[PDB]
């Protein structure tokens, strides 16, 4: 399971284009939107959750938490995600067949 930081500037819930989900450790990332935020897109990627946002363990905590704070997010974001292994996310995938980047976005 790696693990690493992810810091990049949050104006109030736009670019940050990654869609959460809810985990135990913190938010598997269901998705994310390319092109919204540079360090995101060289940062994060499908298949991973973030167990750490800015200095605060996103583990054990429920995804409103997460989904708040991620949303309430507003100077400099830095949110270690965890890669674990494969397996979840190729047959079925997180994201349906909704549209483009139909995700729950903060």
């Known amino acids: 399971l790696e693990k690493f930081n992810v810091d990049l500037m949050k104006k ?3 670019e940050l284009g990654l869609s ?5 450790i913190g938010c598997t990332i269901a998705d994310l939107i390319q092109g919204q935020y540079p360090e995101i897109d ?3 990627q499908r ?3 973030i167990t750490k ?3 605060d ?14 949303k309430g997010a507003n100077g ?6 965890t890669r674990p292994k494969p397996g979840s996310g190729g047959s079925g995938s997180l994201v349906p067949r909704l549209l483009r980047r139909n995700q729950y976005w903060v």
């Open 53 to 55: 946002f800015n200095g």
């Open 12 to 14: 109030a819930g736009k």
């Open 57 to 70: 363990a996103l583990e054990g905590l429920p995804f409103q938490v997460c989904y708040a704070l991620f």
């Open 76 to 81: 400099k974001v830095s949110m270690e995600v």
């Open 47 to 49: 298949g991973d959750i």
């Open 42 to 44: 060289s940062k994060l």
């Open 20 to 24: 959460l989900s809810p985990n135990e």
